[PDB]
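Entry 0007
Protein: yukd protein
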Amino acid sequence: HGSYIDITIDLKHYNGSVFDLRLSDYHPVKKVIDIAWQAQSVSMPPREGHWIRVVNKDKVFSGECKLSDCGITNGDRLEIL
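Output (structure tokens):
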């Protein structure tokens, strides 16, 4: 169910790492955050609100939005705030 997209996650506001991710766009922008914490050594944790900024598009989305509904596609870089 959905459609696979290749994106980049940027933890600039945390340990500063950057990884690439491929997942179904029917997922909530929030999913990128769960995955981010599982995959990386982020001794933080994440900030409430779960807000993301699509760097290449200079637009912020609520972590509750559906990725597809945010026009987020391959190439997009999501900066977790």
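Curator remark: The radius of gyration is 11 Å. Residues 1-81 form a domain with the Ubiquitin-like (UB roll) fold (CATH 3.10.20.90).
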